[PDB]
Amino acid sequence: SGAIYVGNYRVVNRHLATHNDWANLVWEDSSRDLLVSSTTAQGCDTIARCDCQTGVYYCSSRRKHYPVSFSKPSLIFVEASEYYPARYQSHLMLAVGHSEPGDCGGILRCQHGVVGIVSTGGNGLVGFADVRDLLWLDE
Numbered sequence: 001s002g003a004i005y006v007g008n009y010r011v012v013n014r015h016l017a018t019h020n021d022w023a024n025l026v027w028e029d030s031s032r033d034l035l036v037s038s039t040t041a042q043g044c045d046t047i048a049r050c051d052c053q054t055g056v057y058y059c060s061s062r063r064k065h066y067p068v069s070f071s072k073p074s075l076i077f078v079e080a081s082e083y084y085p086a087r088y089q090s091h092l093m094l095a096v097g098h099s100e101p102g103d104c105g106g107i108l109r110c111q112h113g114v115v116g117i118v119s120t121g122g123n124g125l126v127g128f129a130d131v132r133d134l135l136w137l138d139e
């Protein structure tokens with residue numbers, strides 16, 4: 001679990017969005033596993049606007065933060081799950097690191113701000129949905 005709170009927006013994994021997220025929907029994209037909903041309170045987070053490929057992510061299954069080197073956002077094949085059929089997920093960044101399904105929503109940050117959230121994983125892999133291209137989150 002986990003979300004980004006920026007301005008009057010809440011960014012979550014689309015597969016974990018709540019009834020309230022869908023009732024306050026701003027934008028969603030199944031191909032990215034992202035959903036953004038509106039909030040009444042002002043958020044606590046800053047979004048990075050950069051090309052960093054190193055950062056730190058929070059891993060809830062270890063209660064710890066880990067440093068990572070990650071690939072640039074790209075189209076990556078993701079096997080079928082209870083949430084989605086087998087498909088290519090876009091704007092995904094992979095890295096070597098521990099993750100389990102419940103880790104989705106953990107934030108990845110670089111020195112500039114929030115880069116993205118945990119969205120996929122594998123045997124010693126962790127994948128993050130990028131949010132740096134969503135310029136409208138800042139306005």
Ligand SMILES: CSc1ccc(N2CCCC2=O)cc1NC(=O)N1CCC[C@H](C(N)=O)C1
Nearest residue numbers: 033078081099100101104119120121122123
């Ligand atoms: C952090 S998610 C994760 C982490 C570890 C694993 N494991 C750990 C060992 C074997 C294995 O595959 C499996 C996942 N699940 C996973 O990637 N998905 C399920 C939720 C929806 C995701 C999507 N964006 O399509 C895909």
Ligand SMILES: [Zn+2]
Nearest residue numbers: 050052110112
């Ligand atoms: Zn950065």
